[model samples]
Target: ARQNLKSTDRAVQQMLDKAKREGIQTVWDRYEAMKPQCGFGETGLCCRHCLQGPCRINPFGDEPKVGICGATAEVIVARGLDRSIAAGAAGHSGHAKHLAHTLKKAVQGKAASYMIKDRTKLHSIAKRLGIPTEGQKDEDIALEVAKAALADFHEKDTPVLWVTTVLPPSRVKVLSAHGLIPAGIDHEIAEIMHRTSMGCDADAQNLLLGGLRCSLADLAGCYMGTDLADILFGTPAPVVTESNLGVLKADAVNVAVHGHNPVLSDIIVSVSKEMENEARAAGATGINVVGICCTGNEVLMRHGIPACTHSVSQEMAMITGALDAMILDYQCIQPSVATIAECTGTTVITTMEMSKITGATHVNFAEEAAVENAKQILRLAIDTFKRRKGKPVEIPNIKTKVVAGFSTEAIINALSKLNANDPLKPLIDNVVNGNIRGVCLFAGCNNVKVPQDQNFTTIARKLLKQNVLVVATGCGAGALMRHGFMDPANVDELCGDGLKAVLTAIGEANGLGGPLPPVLHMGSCVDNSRAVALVAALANRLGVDLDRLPVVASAAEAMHEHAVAIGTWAVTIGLPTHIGVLPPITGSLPVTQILTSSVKDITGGYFIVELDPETAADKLLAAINERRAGLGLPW
Candidate 1:
């Protein structure tokens, strides 16, 4: 059960061993083979952004301090960081644009398969944005809402409206006072690129500020994405589901929808039912649809679809070879899967024109043509199922049952059972009385060095014992949810006395027979906005700023640009953020100081870098106690 077999679950290790036996290479193989990574790039010392110099500043202090363009250590480091933030913003904001575009089409009846599934959510969003829905048709209201969401990306003079609207006003004033408030999502992202260019921003502090602005734009985009997604996918409620590669079945043809977007994955889920007979005819039994990554989280939250895999072991799903076809939409998907599938005789299908993998089958997907494309994708999977029918394969027989769909709406609804008029009072009381010490959101992806889910499991166990309420998102949810942390029955065994009583009281009040899980599964990485919403509501109730709230965020195994973007935004929005991996800014003391120290004076939040799980938990608890003490609450 304690799978320490080469930095992953036992099933994953078995497949890696099996792959080795069959002369196949995995990410581990390549990672192990690429042992001596470049130190210059590792420390943020190399700057090749422009043709100016392919510059390298000597961290040993023996060489030049500036680049060919006379850029200093902080300048080069801050430039690199700004670009990474923009890269993440581009991915998240780009996804938000596509979803908003789909909504616009659905408003016009162009996307017939998609409609406003959560009308109440639509009304609420419209009201919050001051868009009038009175005496208006749904599509007409939808068009306005859709356009309003899209408007955040294009406004030139004003900050992204959602930055001012959804986030706490005091938080906005802080950002505005410092001029860190972003214009449009695209405007901020573009400015980041422009400022980090060879001749643009030279001041290290100024460039890092630019990075924070782009990060806020990311938060704005994610907020809109969560809002629009709920409107389109029908807001999720509690649902029983399964996770792990064992969700892949031997008798059934398994198609894993992998990515972060629901636009196409939802269609795939809908069409799979209609094409089950076709799959049955092509296969021995029926079609089995599972998910991977945040696509796994998206559909799992919506339809109880099994989350078969997350960030790191994505290839392990195919290594089981029970995976007949892996259909991808966009983001966090490994390109090596094309080779892995080719070598292992699994079908790899890539959707989304912008996200095509070179060695994978390309299937151009559009929301307007969703149904037909979904059917075509299903049929392709069915065809591949027949090819894999007689082939040898292995499923890990490892899985866990989970109760997911803890969207902020669902949380409030459950809490409403405790106090019909004041849903937040009970949680506030718990925190104030030390029944709940504080809250921590464990979000982001897994990295190879950490042994997947090890830190999350470790830190979560420690924090829950310390009475910190644990909530997860992205692969962090995939990790924790897979380990039975979402099983309410485990609360007594896993939770501290005060927290156990709180969860039990709330769960029974909500009419569930048992307690709420020790860990709440919020949603994907993009759904970090859900935490923002919850914290802001709490902050308003306490009549204090978010910076004064006793909440902390940690990405225990963060491995991507999205993690950096999300972490930076978390700090900008006034939460002490912890990253397990040391960032690429240590080469410049000024850049590092601003990130870890001076910014705290400016924004009341800063980065705490710690790799050890238990030590990280201690630091988080200390910070939470400090925040509580500052708020004149019991530590």
Candidate 2:
């Protein structure tokens, strides 16, 4: 009866019902079990940074106002936020660093399965970093690019190159004026750890600024992650695909790649094709390689693979009993999948040495023998498929057509069709003329605390109907695409007349018969860099800083520390950012007001903390209108 309360998708609802009937524990059950979660921790008033105290401040007028180390509620909140930023920065930057190493290996002829797929991206990034590329081989240029990317991780005399180089010059000036420019990505993260330690950095304002600096480093890592990924995996171009649990074919050997990185998943995708006969010979029709999370986003962007599920609903894919193997690499993967696989008889495979699940099979992936490792993983899937052969599956006959893969390069290329010499002119003209109100980027992941995708769906529906052009990445894309937001056919139903005409013109100019999707899928979470690229171009053309642009961002269903880091950077970059769930900083009035109100005077951006989707949408629109009015444009 309550199945529909779990998710908007019928397939997910079906699986939820099945899980409930089978008495299998899902994320919702665990969340319910954790009811009335510690209010002190919920409000960011608790501290366990040292053994001297696991102190928590009382919300009421009571004792225990400070920790044993004399940390105030404000200090505890600030330190907690700072630590979240550091962890988030480390997760994203670590992903970027892994790619840097892979790029180095490819250039050294050690990575045979990998090659420079997009020399255009390679040369573009190399030149941006001031590396010589004229008359140089792609490998040579890539080697230098790899080195420069790696050098960014350490403390350097100059500000992080990726951050300063990518932002608009005017925006960079604001960051410089505020001393928010990161010295280095790794250095800022390390500094955050040291500063947030037991007795260090007690001032809330100073701690928040340090968190901002580290968040910029997170931005650097995310931007370079996109840049290097495009160079290695080839930039994602628009491709048609499908989403939801219905994508799992009952007669095929289904393998779903979870996690974020494409280094191993891309190879797995290619290797699946070569080993299709092995799967067929093992009693399956063919090997169907699908995606689960951002890893799914990566391949779906590049290769048109279907996304089975995302974020909170990942286990639902296995609950369908159709997924043969779920391969994972790193971030956002839940360990509970291994537990669910036990119930479903699905093979859960974990690659990557750093991430290992106790109940899952480990394949230990390597870049050198990438293809070989991929083949081994595929063989395991095929073997598992044989065991699952003829077994009943609960696939809910539900799916939505998804037109994704709108990278920054792809978007610009599409725009160039309308304005050959000045690609951004058409977009800028439309914004200035009020045909498009502004841009809203829906990002981050689904939190089980809310009905999955409900926030994303409600907010997006309101924004699209009001003519705010929407773009999405990470699980936000999964949420919207599953509901047909990325379907060109839904433009008539979803978009305002002004926005509908603009999308149709761009689609027709690019020779597509219909409008492009209302919500452009701009790759994975790391690929939020694509959105920045677009806004940077717009700001540069208009002779204004990012703060003056009528743009906003929302992590409507945010759940991860990476989301905390991402939200911080979004605010730092001068966008009115919305978070649907309440952050832990409410215990400290200074921290809350500084983020939600006072910080706007300094950075021209602030957080709009609203949980109701309609109200959040209204607030974001008001934010856009405010910026539009500031720019002397009609709202």
Candidate 3:
């Protein structure tokens, strides 16, 4: 069905081979079928905002230059880009709203199985929001805190609480002076949709400013998601676990937890323990819980659960045939998974009410009935195990030990192993002295447009050799883990001399005797906020701003709306972000110029678009060096 082997992961390679033997098509095969994608759509020249015409501005001069309503290529391109930013903001902010709801419920003592795990974080967050916490019980403080977070969604007169807290006042004043500060998180999303409709916000620059507003709302969502999640499920600390398809046990009832939120997945983890006896009664040894997608990052970092696969490989896990069930929550879940799992005699159970797939089982999950819902899903999985009795399963022996769970606190704690009284000083000093050139955070998704895992590993290898400390989240981290980059043993081989020495010292201090992983896996896409937290801590210790620090981020194979939001906010808050794939704004030069260059004057960061891996790495290095020079560090 598909020609080239585009992935370097051996498990993926094996599954691609198996797809042929069993006559099943994969993501790559389907991608091959969509040959010669539309030119107008690819270049962002097409527009469907009005009913008069589905218009396009052909750049080659073979077709009309304006829409039916006299809109130029600039208007069409800017409108489309603004719409994508709004979608991204809406999606991630919606995720944050869900977490806030859980926090509110927990504060009221309605969610029985959940409790606040990080009291210090809870109170710190409470105090920052200016809630009255003096002499109040933790629950009362939590109620006010949750109210403050929820107010970010509805308050239209002022900026969202989380957005106001994104950077220190000194940094945010710059954004405020430029009108880049969002009044409300939901209001920003709503405003973009309104402005991009038909005739509103026609000026390319004005439309782009609207995109910036939506982007800041996205930053709020990411921070809120990470903050509330850490309060509920303790912040991640470094722990060892396994990764890849080999994590699936042949004899156990293999259930892969997939999707973004930890709400339902956390309950599943708790309920799985009690279902071990039932699973064994169905001719399996026990229930072997493995993670896929962001759900994989959530549990893997917190509970040391093995990661079975990531974005593109979710269906591949089912093809292994060892899988009994694919229990999913929400976000980034493929609808076609039901067909793949059905072919292999595996049950695909959709948990979230909003995310339902045809030909799959849907069990709507809610916080109030979380335990009963989790146990019900586990029983269905056990029942599905009995149905896969005679089905052939080919479990690949391709996996490796990975050390994950590097939260901001965990990273500082490890650094505290070196200097307990001054954790940030050691890390900041390393940056100042050039023992570490800079830090690069890799965050984004998998796209069939490029070879899976190729771009990320290639860029990481080049940067790591230059002594840049690499931290990753989302599918980008999964890509690095699939290769040997995430293995602690490879630090000596992968990192430059100075970086290796620093890592080795910290590793030895932790009694590891070697080094921490050449790349740190920070958790899911939402957990990208963790990187910001670490950067803010460093900036606070050095009495500088994030834009002055030698730090940057890259999303090589960005494929979703959430990525657009994440990258936008990364640049908005002050980190040069590089995207390897060409975005849809190439059709309009005015819109494209503002995004790549002009916005830097407004927000202190901008976008770098490069297609080749080596060139992309060079651009990232240049940006890092530019920041280094600005900070008066060594060349």
Candidate 4:
């Protein structure tokens, strides 16, 4: 199969070729074999809810317009979408909850391996949550913050503060008026599960509204994930790194930290430095830990760790036979990596108790013994390297210069260099003067259905050349970074004249010789909150609600259920959100119409469901131009 040609990255193509030649099946092979996927499932017409019947509606108007229980196609499609949002919300909240518990233990002095690294963020979050932090020790303030984070997961009297506090007051008023304020993260998720379960709530529009509320919970969960991660690990500052298979070294013990959480991965990064001698003693030069997926994004943001691979190409990292170990935590990890590891002599290590794979080694990571556990995991990689050392390995000689770790604070800090007072004035003036046309945030993952990174790069190139500023997170960042979109050297090549001038001015003011990268790499998927923080700042500063901003978001090549929740929140937050893949709701005209068109009247945002990259870019630019017109700004 010529499946290797489907990817945009040279290194991935190389590994896919290798996997094919060696007769080892990869995700691409399986995807190719799954050709002509189920039409009923694709259109959201299939229902297996009650086991009363695994009924499916004939989208061609053949037999059943409704299910066995008289549930209409609209109800089936709405319930399906609602359940995906609930699942996505649960995943993000669970990740945040893990960090919250880790923070709680650190503050209680029970977890010696963890401690508060960002006291400013701790105090800031505490103050935002209305906790009394004046004159309080960092430990006490942190304990209270942790408790508040934990309380947000339950059915509390007050609404989720993380949601209510982060948005502009006008946007908050709109959401409150629509009754979209989430009671609690877990409660909203549970409610969705309850409502979507057999015959409870079937009104397509009401089910969608309920999904919107739960998506607000997803936003809260994601915001807490970013906040608590910043408090535990230091807030991300701009750091230089590299990406692609070339980052994997044959002589060193190469461990790829995969998945979404930094709680244990950050500790592993710290302990790797201390265990260099151990690795050397084991006949390796040193420990080279790379990142994969969002966990890679986390450490890459803070520690300058190179990302090996992400999303659809995860198995290719092992196919290179250079990755000694793949350390995983939670989301976006494919179980098939264990199968690839079996062929490549690599050790696949699963850390989280909730995410164990059939053929992978489990470490059962605990915050209490984090340091020791990290050391143990590293030792396992060191041992693996010893056996495979000096053996023939194929590592694709490809990598790109990456400048990531642009948190909202970092962006403000960078802009502050331009104007010590009124830092945002420079950015605001750029937008007003047409120097920067608008802003776009690229988020979500790589899907096998499309050529990996094809949609992201295609749309990004068009937007960048049109002077639209871009920021990226999750595998969208990984996809673009692998293609040199994050390299400052490409600014002149990729960015428009006005945008180039703005970036150059910022770089010069900051003491860099050249312009900033065309695309700013914000953090992981959980850190999409950083983008929200920036938009909120912009909205509040401009004396306008979020709906008036000339900004948009896209999750091109979206693959995860988490992306569903994330995209839902993006729409609810008043951004014209784009998804490259068609969701399964196409079976119901009403549900699809509400999501794509009519919902904009209520929330000031709606879905732009375009699959072609060029057309998608045009539509998004149209959206930005529409907002520019709304604000009476020259387009």
Candidate 5:
């Protein structure tokens, strides 16, 4: 039934047909009806960082060569790229900072709402970092552990140990040779900003390298000493999940949390439980809580698709009218949300200092008092739910089953289970050979500017058809779940034989209808850090240096700057990443070259930007085939 739509075009046509049958029109109809007002060609060219000039570089040839600051296209592009890296780094590091704060709280016994959900994983992390976990009280052990975790931000002498561990020894050697090992997270990020501010790091290649360094620190801080997140959080494996506007529930009071930080969403999820209870106390039967964008992936990784919305679907979800309130934390909370909320009863609540819009209610998120904050937010949402006077809400009946929670450990175990003889070795050989295709790590958030889940879904379906094993994290996993691919019953029909066999076995072993298939759903944006660990473990288990392993290719369809940084570091650690969206790179050839080509010399992999969904799918497929060919696999 899924195959009836041979391509994305057909799928859209099918959706339109279904909408027609149901006597409803979609947002696409309105979008098509609108007249073009903004200049299409100059959309990617405007630069407004400083007050001297909000420069718009002309698209046509023989135009003015520089901005008022005498900033040439190269300079402008370089600055823009650097700023994006900075923003991405800042967003990712912000999350890291929150985690660090939470870690400190967890250690000091100050956090009442939060607990060390995985003490086993915590202890394992401490052991890996050589912290004293032996015969120590949990508090003392946790304090030292928290100190170690926080130290990655400012430690200057050593390379952040966690990031260093994931690299192929050769790559690590190269980084050391080049003096590019990150001393501290803040130091690296600060250096990038200081260097790229005006004329400091004018050399584009060097500037990008600094960006890469900041990324390395992010990886080290976020994932270092937390290998147990995989065991506890579950590594993302291939499981079907869905994304886009279709996943919002109609009959329930929908509360979608938008943004990158999990602080608010974590509280929202907890408060939703209370809200559910409060709703019963009021008149409503239940409250539905789903997150949008990165926060969505954050919760989806931990609790599956029930916890969030896709990246591009945030505004669309708001349009659903079923949304009782859209709560935001930080990063990717659109300004349009305020304007949209004004048209409906959906109260928009902004939780972060930077994210508050003029019309939205502001609630500063305090980690120490998360439960109280959650209760307050829940009461507001339940009160809003009671005020609904519109017609019966109609949410699209579209949802896919997905097996989320594939951690590095889960992947390793899955690898072990895959081989009948010399299980681990054979499994590696299958990947090396063409029998088991190479993996594509689909990770990142959704964006309205992009074609929703079109890029992710296209790539996944294409890769699966080509016999490549696909693993996803964050909103990428949510993208699959909305499409109904996660159901074990659908695996045989949707996936290749080798993948089908694995899913069936998992289902049988677990005594389920079908196993959660190869598409392992790893958790949140923070969890993409786990992918590096999984690759490292797999490389080690396969008896190959990380760079030479069959594990190749990753993509973040609608990526932000942190994703770029993360993706770049993944390449530096020897995983070639293809980014779906192109940042403003055309303005600087040197910067583009450095990001796309020069990084390969240092970290066996480089970045490629493919904008078109089909083309993106082709690029991913080609990457897998190329890696397979390099590994002497049969095509």
Candidate 6:
């Protein structure tokens, strides 16, 4: 067993070795023990909504089928997809609701804590949504804009205008003809849930399509008018950032915030200032607030702040025992956090209304009254440092400075700076000459069970070193930031000589503090949709259809079903999205075929699922090189 071990599996092997030394026996002693969970349909079954049944659909072989509700394998998959859409919509809309409340407060001038930073984004969004931004009082326009944005939660009949904009005209027409266009964000999500419940939408395809509509609604609501966030908070581009267990500072009072929404994190950043003041008053230095998980990226993109860790590092962050507090807002809040905090003096705070940890202190955040709650939480976090033991703590000695803010506008502006006469010409020249290969958009959630940053960092580093341009969003971007690969200075060390020269020359021509080298930091998970639009825009601006363009690949280490559907939707539209983990497509081999091969024929692109990071990187690089070669470019 020892001789068979590979160095790539060292992390896992170390834990196994430690367990053996401690006389702890691990399960799954043989291959057969792991075979049962490998079945697709059985593992992917779902029926959690009602009391009538907890259905299990086994699509393996011709085994006599039973779906508790008499549903088929396809129906079960559809139900799972629909349920995921509802959950995803709920998560995204919840953030939108918070944004609306904040906008309302900003308009009323009751919240001095928040203001419109991106007036351009606001006006653009207002115009797109048919709200008259010009020739109106700022307050009036704010009210109208807020109302219009809020209306996305309930608007019906027309496709949720935001998401529909991304779909090809032909695809939009098909959706409209099929009555699959979403009405409003919340309404569509609810409808999908109701339809997929027991006896509602029986046709699996219809159910899945409904799921698509629900997700589109979320995209519409989240991305449609978010220029306001950019204006107010600042736009995100690729900035140098870091993550992992090492980001925790031992001597400094370390507070880690994890969640999906920026509502809480936005306040937390403000609160960190107040906490520092309070700490100074108490005869201590300042407080250091580091983000963890998705919220980490949310904060990092906007503020260029470092994340304490990505998704997988949460438990490990707690294990550091140096953390003063681990504050959570919503989504991915582990139940173990409450229990783990029990043995240690680490205080766990849950700030959002939906996230409630039984043993943790609850500090509910209201957008209308953000500062009050923020100050309260800050004080509580600051007070906890008194309980720290005298022993000195150690912070991981790993961090790299990165210039991050890069929006679509920023990218355009940066390109203009590169060559004002024809900004995209150089990019085209690179593709044609083989100095630069293609663009890879590495976006999506981080999985804890997987190797630390394997799906995102490994793929990103490999691609960059191979001379491929990498753009990232969500947790995937955070992973890149944490590893020092995204820094302009590190480009010379980490990337291929050719790509490094390009980046170095760009940095020199456009100052090191300007935009970024290559990797661009798009925004939160929802902003990943922006990456899609950016690619489409690049393709259009360069006069190539998306399929004919170099390559755009997505690696989601740990993905929700909504993410899968969205990725597939991108494939349907034009972009070929390669996923890291493959979902169960059991008795639905037809569906798998459509996803892998058939879809490419119809939509110009397809999906590739590669579980191994090295193989995934190789596949991505090969695709990029292949595309470049097809473009009559040198390699």
Structure candidate 4, residue pairs in collision: none
In Å, residue 312's CA in model 5 sits off its true spot by: 1.7
Q: Which runs in model 3 stand beyond 4 Å of their true positions? A: 1-4
Model 3 error, position 109 (Å): 2.4
Candidate 4 residue 474 Cα shift, in angstroms, is 0.2
| lDDT agreement of model 5 with the native | 0.65
- Higher-scoring candidate on TM-score, 2 or 5: 2
In candidate 5, what are the lDDT values of residues 1-635, reduced to their tens digit? 24122213233334445444554434444444553633412233555656766676764566655667666666666666666666666667666666667767755767766666666666777777788887997667666766765777787566576666566566677677767788877777788778766546555566666766777776775574234233223334443355444556665667787776665576577667765766877666687777677677666656654644455445556555678888888776657678767765688988877667998888877777878887778778877877874456545455455566576656555555555444456456656545567777887765434566677777788777766767777667766665655555667667887766555665565445566664666666667777777677666666565666655555546556667666767776776687777666755566567767777787667787777877877776776677667767666
Model 4 Cα displacement at 403 (Å)?
0.7
Task: Please give, for residues 1-635, the per-residue lDDT of candidate 4 as tens digits.
Answer: 56545798989998888987999988877887998899989999998889897989999857977899999999999999999999999999999999999999988989989999998998889888899987888999999999889999887788899899999889999999999999999999999999999989989999999999999999999999999999889999988899999998888999999999989999999999999999999988899999999999999999999999999999998988888999999999889988878899999999998899998999978999999899889998998998897789999999999999899999999999999988899999999999899999999999998998999999999999999999999999999999999999999899999999999999888888888899999999999999999999999999999989999999999999999999999999999999999899998999999999998987899999999999999999999999999999999
lDDT of 1 by residue, 1-635 (tens): 23364554666766777777788777777877988877788789989978777899888867766788888888899999999999898888888898899999998988899999999999999998889989999888889988887888976555688788877788888989999888899998888888888788899888888899899999988888888999999888888888887888888879899999889998888888888788777755788899899988999988999999889878888888778788898899989999888776778888888888888998888788899888888887888878877787889888888888989999999999999899999899999999999999999999876888888888899999988999999999988977778887788888999999999998899788888888988888789999999999998888888999999999999988988999999999999999988788889888888998899998889998898988998999999999989978887
Off by over 4 Å in 6: 1-52, 57-62, 66-69, 165-180, 237-242, 389-394, 400-403, 513-518, 543-545, 621-635
Q: Flag the better candidate by lDDT, 2 or 3.
A: 2
Number of colliding residue pairs in model 2: 0
Instruction: Tell me the RMSD of model 4 versus the true structure.
Output: 0.8
Q: What TM-score goes with each of the models?
A: 0.98, 0.99, 0.98, 0.99, 0.86, 0.87
Model 4 off-target regions past 4 Å? 1-5
Where model 2 places Cα greater than 4 Å from the true spot, the runs are: none
lDDT on C-alpha atoms for all candidate structures: 0.87, 0.93, 0.86, 0.93, 0.65, 0.66
